Design a protein around this ligand. Structure first.
Ligand code: HEM
Length: 154
């Protein structure tokens, strides 16, 4: 839960690459998620009709929702762990309305790492992957604790 200053630097350095194309990264990540863990698609009434990766690729709505997710995640990561204010609304909606278990947040964490690895091999080597894994794990653990604080079992 305590990353080194160097680890946060590696996280924010590759995050800057994501920010050059937020929608493309977001669509790639959601498509990877739905492909790797298809049960997650069923949480989205707006996407559950999409039956193939190619259909997902053509979905402009999926690109927009990719921006929605990554915009929130980027703001969290930039806080370098001090993200209490940012997790409050996300925990509220994801625990009590969307009903997303923490395990699904683990699935999307794996998708994020997969997409970063594929799109940024030169800036996402072993050290950067380790750092991003720690940053996403911190996010998951803190949001799991916030679910519990709100009265819910993630
Ligand atoms: C990095 C992890 C995630 C982030 C930052 C994130 C962020 C967001 C944001 C900002 C919204 C819109 C505002 C809100 O309702 O809170 C949203 C909506 C939503 N999220 Fe997430 N989300 C994440 C992971 C997930 C996962 C893994 C699932 C399901 C597998 C999910 C399911 C949903 C659903 C169903 C909605 C509403 C969709 C709709 O209205 O059509 N989220 N998310």
């Amino acid at each position: 839960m305590v990353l080194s200053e160097g680890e946060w630097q590696l996280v924010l350095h590759v995050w800057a690459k994501v920010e050059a194309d937020v929608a493309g990264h977001g669509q790639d990540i959601l498509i990877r998620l739905f492909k790797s863990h298809p049960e997650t698609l069923e949480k989205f009434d707006r996407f559950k009709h999409l039956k193939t990766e190619a259909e997902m690729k053509a979905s402009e709505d999926l690109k927009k929702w990719g921006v929605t997710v990554l915009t929130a995640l980027g703001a969290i990561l930039k806080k370098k762990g001090h993200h209490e204010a940012e997790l409050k609304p996300l925990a509220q909606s994801h625990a009590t309305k969307h009903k997303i278990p923490i395990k699904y947040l683990e699935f999307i964490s794996e998708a994020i790492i997969h997409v970063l690895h594929s799109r940024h091999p030169g800036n996402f080597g072993a050290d950067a992957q380790g750092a991003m894994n720690k940053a996403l794990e911190l996010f998951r653990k803190d949001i799991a604790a916030k679910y519990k604080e709100l009265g819910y079992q993630g």
